[PDB]
């Protein structure tokens, strides 16, 4: 027992070292290896729990804030699947979570979510596993009607066909083994085991369930769900009453340690070719707390994110007209960067800076993903996606920006939205630069109104919505490449200088008949030519500015 303890301790210390020294090819593999190790030896889960709790307590005493949330989420992931965890360990974890409520956001928020789940699990062991499986596998249950689905969106022009095929194969291989009957068997086995501990003869149970017809299996599945949900909904749930109900069911099943896998969530893979595809898929998902949860995961770079922003804006605009999704659908957004082997991963970089756990777990997936595409097996990518969508519940909100584009001063503008960047270049006349008139409100820390009107000769301009560094209230960072005339004795020389400022809204107009070209979100397909004027402002909520949420593990660690 001591060698297994030391082995698990070494694994946990490896994860901690990865978190404390942000020094690339093995980042994120340590957490995955730890999870695989506990999956191979489930009877040792309690061991890991103790270690985690100790490390967590240590982190609290030494003000090691960078490791608290990763260790807490690892503990919760283990507890969701573990059986035979003694009650004292549940109480210790719950007490730790309650103590963390004194920490500032995001620690208190994550700790509160964990404390809720831990209290329910302590009183009614097996609740977390049952609810996860029922919701993610869309098992029919009147007492727990919640359903969840992961929608995987990939731009075929941004991600290679080999990546798509490999991911599709991993997802299909996982889903072929996750039949409704197998999941019902897993729920029954896990609930009976989590409640009865050593009194549950796991071998006889597995044989009886495998030998039972579908009707019998469904009956026992519904009985177990009923007992768990009835006890969990009581004002004062008692572990003893839950044990009594589970003993009654077990004795009815068998007459008076095989690892139970936690299935991967149900994932639908979609090549994003239509701007309306997301809406259609969500409407289909809702066709017979909000009962349905859609976790939309996008794989790509900043261009994919601009597309996601367009789809989100359209969804909100439609919801204001037909109010059909929001009463029943909880929408959560997730992003995995797939960057070609530095300008297209801006948002990814930003996320990595504000959530180190996201950086070490999600941002490091791009090489592995790419490697998987070159190969002609443990589903590493699927496991990381599963962990991300299950544990990454803290949203970071991003301001969307609306742009009105005028090709002529007499015509109505074309409107679009962007999330990351608006780039503008001077069109070459079929002589260096164009005179631009700019009117903007300077974004000051006091929020003092300061309107600036300037006319200068420039070659281009870039509006960035995502801050580039830690030294940078949602405002645009504008960089203008101005042409400065220097008259030296030897003649008129032209030099270029970059001027930067911050603004919430800006209006720009060309003066010398030279036209502008605009690029939205670095996407060559979102290019507007022959532009005379444009205006940028925060995108209003379709009737408050419209913010798009992207879930991470920790939100913004301050």
């Amino acid at each position: 027992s001591s060698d297994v303890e030391l082995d698990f301790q070494r694994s946990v210390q490896a994860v901690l070292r990865e978190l404390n020294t942000p020094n690339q090819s093995n980042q994120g593999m340590w957490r995955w290896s730890l999870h695989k190790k506990v999956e191979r030896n489930p009877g040792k889960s309690s061991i890991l729990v103790r270690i985690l709790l100790r490390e967590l307590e240590k982190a609290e005493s030494e003000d090691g804030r960078r490791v608290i949330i990763p260790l807490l989420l690892t503990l919760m992931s283990v507890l969701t699947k573990a059986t035979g965890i003694p009650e004292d360990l549940y109480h210790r974890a719950y007490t730790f979570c309650t103590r963390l409520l004194t920490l500032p956001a995001p620690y208190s928020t994550v700790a509160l979510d964990c404390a809720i789940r831990l209290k329910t699990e302590t009183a009614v062991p097996g609740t977390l596993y049952q609810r996860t499986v029922i919701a993610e596998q869309n098992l029919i249950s009147e007492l727990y009607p919640y359903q969840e689905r992961v929608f995987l969106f990939v731009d075929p022009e941004l991600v290679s066909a080999s990546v798509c095929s490999a991911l599709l194969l991993e997802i299909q291989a996982a889903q072929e083994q996750q039949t409704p009957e197998a999941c019902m068997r897993h729920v029954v086995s896990h609930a009976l085991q989590a409640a009865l501990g050593e009194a549950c003869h796991t071998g006889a149970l597995n044989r009886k369930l495998q030998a039972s017809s579908r009707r019998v299996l469904e009956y026992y599945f519904h009985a177990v769900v009923a007992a768990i949900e009835q006890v969990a909904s009581e004002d004062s749930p008692s572990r003893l009453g839950h044990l009594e109900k589970m003993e009654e069911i077990y004795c009815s099943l068998l007459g008076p340690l095989p690892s139970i896998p936690l299935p991967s969530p149900y994932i639908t893979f979609h090549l994003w070719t239509d701007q309306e595809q997301l809406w259609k898929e969500l409407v289909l998902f809702l066709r017979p707390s909000r009962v349905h949860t859609a976790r939309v995961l996008v794989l790509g770079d900043d261009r994919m994110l601009g597309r996601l922003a367009q789809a989100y804006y359209r969804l909100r605009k439609r919801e204001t007209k037909k109010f059909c999704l929001t009463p029943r659908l909880s929408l959560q957004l997730y992003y995995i960067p797939v960057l070609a082997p530095p300008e297209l991963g801006e948002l990814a970089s930003f996320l990595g800076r504000v959530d180190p756990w996201y950086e070490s777990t999600v941002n490091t997936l791009c090489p592995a993903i790419l490697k998987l595409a070159e190969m002609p097996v443990d589903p590493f990518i699927l496991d990381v996606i599963t962990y991300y969508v299950r544990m990454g519940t803290q949203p970071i909100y991003f301001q969307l920006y609306k742009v009105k584009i005028f090709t002529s001063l007499s015509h109505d503008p074309t409107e679009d939205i962007f999330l990351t960047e608006l780039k503008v270049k001077i069109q070459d006349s079929k002589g260096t630069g164009a005179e631009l008139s700019m009117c903007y409100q300077k974004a000051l820390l006091s929020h003092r109104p300061r309107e600036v009107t300037v006319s200068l000769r420039a070659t281009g301009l870039v509006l960035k919505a995502i801050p580039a560094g830690d030294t940078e209230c949602s405002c645009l960072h504008v960089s203008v490449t101005e042409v400065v005339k220097s008259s030296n004795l030897a003649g008129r020389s032209f030099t270029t200088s970059t001027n930067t400022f911050r603004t919430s809204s800006i209006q720009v107009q060309s003066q010398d008949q030279r036209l502008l070209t605009l690029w939205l979100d670095k996407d060559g397909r979102r290019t507007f030519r022959d532009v005379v004027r444009f205006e940028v402002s925060p995108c209003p909520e379709p009737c408050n500015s419209l913010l798009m949420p992207i879930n991470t593990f920790s939100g913004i660690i301050q």
Binding site: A105, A115, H447, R448, Q558
Partner: protein, 995 residues
């Protein structure tokens, strides 16, 4: 604990016109906002009028309950349900369920808006302007002050309030008693054109006097125009003054009677009808009452998360937050940069309690640009659970040369708001420029600002109320050496700083310190308020303050507990509780410092503010002076105008129509005279030239004002007993001074005035009269001190009042001439060297030898008094124009804008009958009186020091730091023997005589 409450809904059942009711089981640990939301959801579910609740939101409705027949609003939306006063009241009545009425909020009537506009004009500030507040503390205070105001108004007798007498309980000094023969005084009672002298006992009450008068005049009623149907329907009023003699107080205790006895004047009274009490009736309050438990978060046991279900957590106790406080400095920006192009800027953040800095953090320096971004967390070495009530985040912006940092900007943020909730979230604070208030710069367009972020929580964090738990530890016998050291520490004056060893000793033997009230300020100065446990122990001590409560009122000590060094609410509360026993006359004596001490309150609503409101609503004289003090501070201090303005609004809402009308007329007169003074200043190009054209223009403007705009009469701001009428335009003039003040003379508007004498007013514009006000108040206090020693030093503290920013009025002392003018009028400029001139002038004014000798004696006494006063107070610029003498011989000093300790010139010595170095009997008497007065003040050194310390924060140019106050300590020779002090002052007298 689910509490059953029945809610009476605003809708009625379709068939019975009976209001709908909904029974709910509310979590006692929830807040009022959640309770209201639950009521709204239940009403949506059960009302037959659901459309009503769909159309209107809950915020359009008030929550009311009935207590002792009155309606109270559950006003604070964040108040914890179980702390509601209604629940305690119902538990005492064994009433379950209780009833709460949901009543629709109505818009204010046009009459209410007009009255508010009138109030705003009187205040000189719009208290309804929410444009410049980060919270609702102002409105919250407006609502909380309703209940004490209405309690005072409801307990007020309007007839007695209309006629409130000016009296003192202090015994008559021996020298006045010698003027009363056989304990009898003569009073001349006037009515219409007739008068009758009667002889009464000095112990007779006005009622007994009236009864004796009517008995004596029974056969002569028709002669004094007294209807036979009327009987002793009348009151006694002072002739020519709005001052009434009523109640069961002996006639000798009325201040007017004491003044007449002091001067040797006849006591003239008028037999008047009592004023109409209906004029002092207060308009009906439209606002529901608000109970004293509003804003109470409750005890720790009700707020603690320990042992509770998450479903039962709606607020978290501050004492459960075991972490270091932190604030994120996002950055600063400024519209106009300082002209110096190579400056670095950094932010210094301090947690401050009172005057003590508990912890400090700073940002790294960055180039000073129009906007500087740090976006960094500063974590302090103080835990949240240890944050005291009233803690301020003091942010300062410092500038230095790019490689002594100069402090440039500052702003304060109260960390625990008026609802006892820890502040959280984002703040943009507009900062004050440096050429204890939590107010921000109102100039949001041009003043420097800082953006900060405080941590956000899932549930609000509340400071719990302390419970008085019995101390199980509450004795090591204090060693006699440490006893002597503690006594020596207690004996030091208020300016003496406490060492760390002194503080540790005081706190160690706190239970011995509690036995002497004089130890209280020092003991409380040793409290480490940044430690929650020590604060709890301190409140346990305050619960055992029996010696303090039973002791005699030491006004100096009690006022010291209101100084800026003491920010704790409970300490200040026990001080105010002690002050509630202070007499009205003494309250008038200390009202200025009491008004100033409000600046040291953490919040707008406080025990001291309520005390001031009560005393003003009980006594018209106190209320009049309170009005003017508050209004001047509103006009002058942008840092505190809001606090004074809300207090003034409450007072004015309690005044009645008579007082409001008087104040309106006064403000109108002041505005008109200000306009005239501005015009007159614009007509005169040079600083001292008062040409005939300027005088003619002044007279013309005053004539136009009198004929068109001035009220027929108004009460005088510096003396509410005086009522000014028509201007005596021919006597009005511009005075030849840099500030060109107006000399104005009004007729007495009271037809019972016995003399055709004018009320003289010097109207000053562009001059700050608060310094003169303080000095004259201190002179009245010194006179009271000397009167305790039976010393009449015949001072003449004239009326002086500030009416706004650098604008006010001064009383003209009649029959008084400046020494410079006498010296000039007798022999030209060389008169300053003519010792005989002043005595010759006094003998000319007093041709009767007995009157001349009396004037010489009064000169001796007043000279002694002003010598001692100007010595102790260090009054400078004593040229012969700033010293006046009355025709009756009173020497007095004027203009208090600031080679010998005091003025004792050879001509003064000549009036005392000295010739050279030969001592006269009058000079010996002068020396003895000087010594006695000086020692009498020396015995009250602590009171004097405290009074000036409380005025340090007015921004007066000559009272800026404690070093200024050390002058009083040195002048009074603190720490020397009484013999050494007497000898020292006699030496000062001889130094003045020789020089």
């Amino acid at each position: 604990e689910l509490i059953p409450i029945e809610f009476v809904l605003p809708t009625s059942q379709r068939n019975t016109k009976t209001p709908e009711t909904a029974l709910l089981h509310v979590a006692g640990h929830g807040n009022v906002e959640q309770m209201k939301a639950q009521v709204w959801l239940r009403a949506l579910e059960t009302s037959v009028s659901a459309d009503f609740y769909h159309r209107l939101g809950p915020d359009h409705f008030l929550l009311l309950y009935q207590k002792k027949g009155q309606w109270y609003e559950i006003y604070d939306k964040y108040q914890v349900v179980q702390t509601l006063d209604c629940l305690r009241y119902w538990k005492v009545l064994h009433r379950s369920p209780g009833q709460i009425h949901v009543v629709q909020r109505h818009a204010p009537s046009e009459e209410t808006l007009a009255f508010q506009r009138q109030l705003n004009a009187l205040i000189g500030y719009d208290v309804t302007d929410v444009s410049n507040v980060h919270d609702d503390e102002l409105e919250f205070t407006r609502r909380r002050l309703v209940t004490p105001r209405m309690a005072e108004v409801a307990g007020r007798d309007p007839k007695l309030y209309a006629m409130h007498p000016w009296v003192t309980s202090k015994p008559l000094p021996e020298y006045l008693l010698k003027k009363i023969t056989n304990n009898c005084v003569f009073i001349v009672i006037h009515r219409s054109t007739t008068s009758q002298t009667i002889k009464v006992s000095a112990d007779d009450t006005p009622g007994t006097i009236l009864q004796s008068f009517f008995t004596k005049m029974a056969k002569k009623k028709s002669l004094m125009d007294i209807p036979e149907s009327q009987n002793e329907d009348f009151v006694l009023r002072v002739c020519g003054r709005d001052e009434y003699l009523v109640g069961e107080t002996p006639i000798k205790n009325f201040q007017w009677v004491r003044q007449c006895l002091k001067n040797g004047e006849e006591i003239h009274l008028v037999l008047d009808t009592p004023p109409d009490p209906a004029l002092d009736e207060v308009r009906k309050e439209e606002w529901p009452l608000v109970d004293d438990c509003t804003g109470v978060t409750g005890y720790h046991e009700q707020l603690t998360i320990h042992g509770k279900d998450h479903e039962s957590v709606f607020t978290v106790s501050l004492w459960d937050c075991d972490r270091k406080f932190r604030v994120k400095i996002r950055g600063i920006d400024i519209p106009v940069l300082p002209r110096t192009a190579d400056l670095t800027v950094f932010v210094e953040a301090n947690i401050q309690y009172g005057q003590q800095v508990l912890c400090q953090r700073r940002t790294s320096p960055k180039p000073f640009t129009e906007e500087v971004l740090w976006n960094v967390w500063l974590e302090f070495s103080i835990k949240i659970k240890d944050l005291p009530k009233g803690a301020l985040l003091n942010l300062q912006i410092y500038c230095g040369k790019a490689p002594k940092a100069q402090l440039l900007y500052y702003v304060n943020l109260l960390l625990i708001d008026h609802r006892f909730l820890l502040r959280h979230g984002e703040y943009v604070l507009h900062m004050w420029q440096l050429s204890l208030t939590s107010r921000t710069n109102p100039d949001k367009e041009n003043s420097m600002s800082i953006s900060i972020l405080l941590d956000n929580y899932c549930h609000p964090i509340a400071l719990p109320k302390h419970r008085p738990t019995p101390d199980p530890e509450g004795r090591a016998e204090m060693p006699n050496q440490l006893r002597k050291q503690l006594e020596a520490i207690i004996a030091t004056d208020p300016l003496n700083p406490l060492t760390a060893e002194d503080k540790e000793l005081l706190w160690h033997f706190r239970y011995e310190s509690l036995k002497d009230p004089k130890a209280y300020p020092k003991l409380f100065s040793s409290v480490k308020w940044g430690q929650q446990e020590i604060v709890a122990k301190t409140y346990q001590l305050l619960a055992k303050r029996e010696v303090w409560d039973q002791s005699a009122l030491d006004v100096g000590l009690t006022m010291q507990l209101l100084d800026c060094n003491f920010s704790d609410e409970n300490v200040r509360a026990i001080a105010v509780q002690k002050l509630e026993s202070l007499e009205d006359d003494d309250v008038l004596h200390y009202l200025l410092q009491l008004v100033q001490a409000v600046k040291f309150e953490p919040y707008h609503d406080s025990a001291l503010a309520r005390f001031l409101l009560k005393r003003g609503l009980r006594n018209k004289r106190i209320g009049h002076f309170l009005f003017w003090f508050l209004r001047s501070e509103i006009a002058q201090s942008r840092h505190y105008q809001q606090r004074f303005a809300v207090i003034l609004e409450a007072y004015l809402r309690g005044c009645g129509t008579a007082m409001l009308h008087d104040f309106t007329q006064q403000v109108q007169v002041i505005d008109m005279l200000q306009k005239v003074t501005i015009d007159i200043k614009s007509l005169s190009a040079e600083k001292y030239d008062v040409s005939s054209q300027v005088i003619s223009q002044l007279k013309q403007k005053l004539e136009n004002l009198q004929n068109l705009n001035l009220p027929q009469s108004f009460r005088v701001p510096y003396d509410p007993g005086l009522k000014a009428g028509a201007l005596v335009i021919e006597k009005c003039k511009v005075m030849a001074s840099k500030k060109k003040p107006l000399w104005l003379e009004f007729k007495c508007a009271d037809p019972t005035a016995l003399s055709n004498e004018t009320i003289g007013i010097i109207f000053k514009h562009g001059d700050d009269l608060r310094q003169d006000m303080l000095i004259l108040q201190i002179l009245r206090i010194m006179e009271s001190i000397w009167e305790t020693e039976s010393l009449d030093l015949c001072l003449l503290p004239y009326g002086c009042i500030s009416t706004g920013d650098k604008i006010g009025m001064i009383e003209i002392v009649k029959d008084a001439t400046t020494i410079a003018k006498i010296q000039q009028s007798t022999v030209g400029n060389t008169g300053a060297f003519k010792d005989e001139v002043l005595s010759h002038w006094l003998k000319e004014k007093c041709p009767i030898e007995e009157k001349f000798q009396a004037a010489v004696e009064r000169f001796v006494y007043s000279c002694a008094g002003y010598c001692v006063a100007t010595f102790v107070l260090g009054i400078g610029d004593r040229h012969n124009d700033n010293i006046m003498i009355s025709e009756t011989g009173n020497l007095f000093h004027i203009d208090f804008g600031h080679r010998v300790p005091f003025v004792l010139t050879p001509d003064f010595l000549f009036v005392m009958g000295t010739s050279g170095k030969k001592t006269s009997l009058h000079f010996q008497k002068f020396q003895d009186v000087c010594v006695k007065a000086y020692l009498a003040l020396r015995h009250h050194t602590n009171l004097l020091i405290i009074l000036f310390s409380m005025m340090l924060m007015t921004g007066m140019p000559q009272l800026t730091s404690k070093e200024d106050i050390e002058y009083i300590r040195d002048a009074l020779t603190v720490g020397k023997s009484e013999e050494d002090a007497k000898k020292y002052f006699l030496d000062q007298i001889e130094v003045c005589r020789d020089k």
